[PDB]
Protein backbone atom coordinates (compact mmCIF):
# COMPACT_ATOMS: atom_id res chain seq x y z
CA UNK A 1 0.00 0.00 0.00
CA UNK A 2 2.80 2.57 0.86
CA UNK A 3 5.23 3.77 -1.89
CA UNK A 4 8.74 2.20 -1.45
CA UNK A 5 12.06 3.74 -2.57
CA UNK A 6 14.05 0.79 -4.07
CA UNK A 7 17.75 1.29 -4.94
CA UNK A 8 19.35 -1.27 -7.31
CA UNK A 9 23.15 -1.26 -7.78
CA UNK A 10 24.15 -1.81 -11.42
CA UNK A 11 27.56 -3.50 -11.70
CA UNK A 12 29.86 -1.39 -13.94
CA UNK A 13 27.06 0.15 -16.04
CA UNK A 14 27.74 1.92 -19.38
CA UNK A 15 25.75 5.17 -19.85
CA UNK A 16 23.55 3.08 -22.25
CA UNK A 17 22.90 0.48 -19.46
CA UNK A 18 21.79 3.29 -17.07
CA UNK A 19 19.34 4.71 -19.66
CA UNK A 20 17.98 1.25 -20.60
CA UNK A 21 17.58 0.36 -16.89
CA UNK A 22 15.59 3.59 -16.23
CA UNK A 23 13.25 2.95 -19.21
CA UNK A 24 12.49 -0.72 -18.27
CA UNK A 25 11.97 0.22 -14.59
CA UNK A 26 9.65 3.12 -15.61
CA UNK A 27 7.45 0.74 -17.68
CA UNK A 28 6.93 -1.69 -14.72
CA UNK A 29 3.36 -1.45 -13.25
CA UNK A 30 3.43 0.41 -9.90
CA UNK A 31 6.61 2.43 -10.66
CA UNK A 32 5.84 6.21 -10.35
CA UNK A 33 9.49 7.48 -10.57
CA UNK A 34 13.03 6.41 -11.70
CA UNK A 35 16.49 8.01 -11.32
CA UNK A 36 20.23 7.25 -11.48
CA UNK A 37 21.79 7.92 -8.02
CA UNK A 38 24.89 7.23 -5.90
CA UNK A 39 28.46 8.52 -5.69
CA UNK A 40 29.40 6.46 -8.82
CA UNK A 41 26.10 7.06 -10.74
CA UNK A 42 25.68 3.21 -10.71
CA UNK A 43 22.29 3.02 -8.90
CA UNK A 44 18.80 2.72 -10.42
CA UNK A 45 16.39 4.22 -7.88
CA UNK A 46 12.70 3.30 -8.28
CA UNK A 47 9.67 4.62 -6.39
CA UNK A 48 6.54 2.47 -6.65
CA UNK A 49 3.53 0.94 -4.89
CA UNK A 50 3.50 -2.90 -4.62
CA UNK A 51 6.44 -3.37 -7.13
CA UNK A 52 7.76 -6.94 -7.51
CA UNK A 53 11.42 -5.98 -6.81
CA UNK A 54 12.66 -9.58 -7.47
CA UNK A 55 11.07 -9.32 -11.00
CA UNK A 56 12.45 -5.80 -11.65
CA UNK A 57 15.98 -7.10 -10.75
CA UNK A 58 15.46 -10.28 -12.82
CA UNK A 59 14.35 -8.10 -15.81
CA UNK A 60 17.47 -5.84 -15.47
CA UNK A 61 19.66 -9.02 -15.29
CA UNK A 62 18.26 -10.64 -18.52
CA UNK A 63 17.87 -7.40 -20.59
CA UNK A 64 20.52 -4.86 -19.41
CA UNK A 65 23.59 -6.34 -17.53
CA UNK A 66 24.53 -9.43 -15.40
CA UNK A 67 25.09 -7.43 -12.13
CA UNK A 68 21.94 -5.87 -10.55
CA UNK A 69 21.33 -6.06 -6.73
CA UNK A 70 18.90 -4.31 -4.37
CA UNK A 71 21.02 -2.16 -2.00
CA UNK A 72 18.29 0.06 -0.32
CA UNK A 73 14.59 -0.23 0.58
CA UNK A 74 12.91 2.73 2.39
CA UNK A 75 9.13 3.00 2.81
CA UNK A 76 8.00 6.59 1.89
CA UNK A 77 6.16 8.48 4.72
CA UNK A 78 2.92 10.28 3.64
Amino acid sequence: MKPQKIVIKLGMPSPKNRTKAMVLAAKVYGVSSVAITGDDKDQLEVVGVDVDTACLVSCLRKKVLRRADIMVVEEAKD
Binding site: K9, T37, D39, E74
Partner: protein, 91 residues
Protein backbone atom coordinates in the same frame (compact mmCIF):
# COMPACT_ATOMS: atom_id res chain seq x y z
CA UNK B 1 31.37 8.49 20.25
CA UNK B 2 31.36 7.47 16.52
CA UNK B 3 31.66 11.07 15.07
CA UNK B 4 34.80 11.86 17.19
CA UNK B 5 36.52 8.62 15.97
CA UNK B 6 35.54 9.57 12.38
CA UNK B 7 36.86 13.16 12.96
CA UNK B 8 40.22 11.62 14.15
CA UNK B 9 40.47 9.76 10.76
CA UNK B 10 39.93 12.96 8.66
CA UNK B 11 36.11 12.71 8.16
CA UNK B 12 34.13 16.02 8.25
CA UNK B 13 30.46 15.88 7.09
CA UNK B 14 30.35 19.70 6.51
CA UNK B 15 33.10 19.16 3.83
CA UNK B 16 31.56 15.99 2.21
CA UNK B 17 30.29 16.41 -1.39
CA UNK B 18 26.45 16.17 -1.36
CA UNK B 19 24.83 12.79 -2.07
CA UNK B 20 23.75 12.22 -5.67
CA UNK B 21 19.93 11.98 -5.17
CA UNK B 22 16.69 13.39 -6.68
CA UNK B 23 13.44 14.50 -5.04
CA UNK B 24 10.84 12.14 -6.60
CA UNK B 25 7.42 13.58 -7.56
CA UNK B 26 4.47 12.47 -5.36
CA UNK B 27 6.47 11.60 -2.20
CA UNK B 28 7.88 13.92 0.52
CA UNK B 29 11.52 14.99 0.15
CA UNK B 30 14.09 13.19 2.35
CA UNK B 31 15.34 15.56 5.13
CA UNK B 32 18.59 13.64 6.05
CA UNK B 33 21.90 12.90 4.27
CA UNK B 34 23.85 9.73 5.15
CA UNK B 35 27.50 9.01 4.33
CA UNK B 36 28.86 5.44 4.33
CA UNK B 37 32.54 4.61 4.98
CA UNK B 38 34.69 1.43 4.89
CA UNK B 39 37.92 1.88 6.95
CA UNK B 40 37.02 5.64 7.00
CA UNK B 41 36.90 5.93 3.13
CA UNK B 42 33.57 7.21 1.72
CA UNK B 43 31.96 4.39 -0.37
CA UNK B 44 28.62 6.12 -1.00
CA UNK B 45 26.07 8.67 0.29
CA UNK B 46 22.31 9.01 0.07
CA UNK B 47 19.21 10.60 1.63
CA UNK B 48 16.68 9.19 4.13
CA UNK B 49 13.70 10.35 6.23
CA UNK B 50 14.13 11.61 9.81
CA UNK B 51 12.33 9.70 12.65
CA UNK B 52 12.21 6.48 10.56
CA UNK B 53 14.33 3.56 9.30
CA UNK B 54 15.51 2.05 6.05
CA UNK B 55 17.14 -1.24 5.06
CA UNK B 56 20.43 -1.18 3.13
CA UNK B 57 23.32 -3.31 1.93
CA UNK B 58 26.47 -2.42 3.94
CA UNK B 59 29.38 -4.59 2.71
CA UNK B 60 27.87 -8.11 2.36
CA UNK B 61 25.08 -7.52 4.99
CA UNK B 62 21.44 -6.40 4.79
CA UNK B 63 21.01 -4.08 7.84
CA UNK B 64 18.34 -1.72 9.28
CA UNK B 65 19.50 1.90 9.76
CA UNK B 66 17.40 3.84 12.35
CA UNK B 67 17.17 7.63 11.70
CA UNK B 68 16.11 9.77 14.71
CA UNK B 69 14.38 13.25 14.40
CA UNK B 70 17.88 14.92 14.18
CA UNK B 71 19.12 12.56 11.36
CA UNK B 72 21.38 10.63 13.82
CA UNK B 73 21.86 7.06 12.55
CA UNK B 74 21.91 3.84 14.64
CA UNK B 75 21.87 0.09 13.86
CA UNK B 76 24.12 -2.99 13.78
CA UNK B 77 26.67 -2.50 10.99
CA UNK B 78 29.50 -4.78 9.86
CA UNK B 79 33.06 -4.32 11.24
CA UNK B 80 35.09 -1.63 9.39
CA UNK B 81 31.96 0.22 8.17
CA UNK B 82 30.62 3.54 9.46
CA UNK B 83 27.44 5.42 8.55
CA UNK B 84 26.86 9.05 9.61
CA UNK B 85 23.72 11.19 9.22
CA UNK B 86 23.09 14.97 9.12
CA UNK B 87 20.15 17.28 8.32
CA UNK B 88 19.88 18.01 4.59
CA UNK B 89 20.60 21.77 4.26
CA UNK B 90 17.32 23.74 4.59
CA UNK B 91 15.52 21.00 6.62
Amino acid sequence: NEYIDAKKHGIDLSRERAPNFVDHPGIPPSDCFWFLYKNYVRQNAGVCQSDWSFDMKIGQYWVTIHTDEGCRLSGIIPAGWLILGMKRPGF
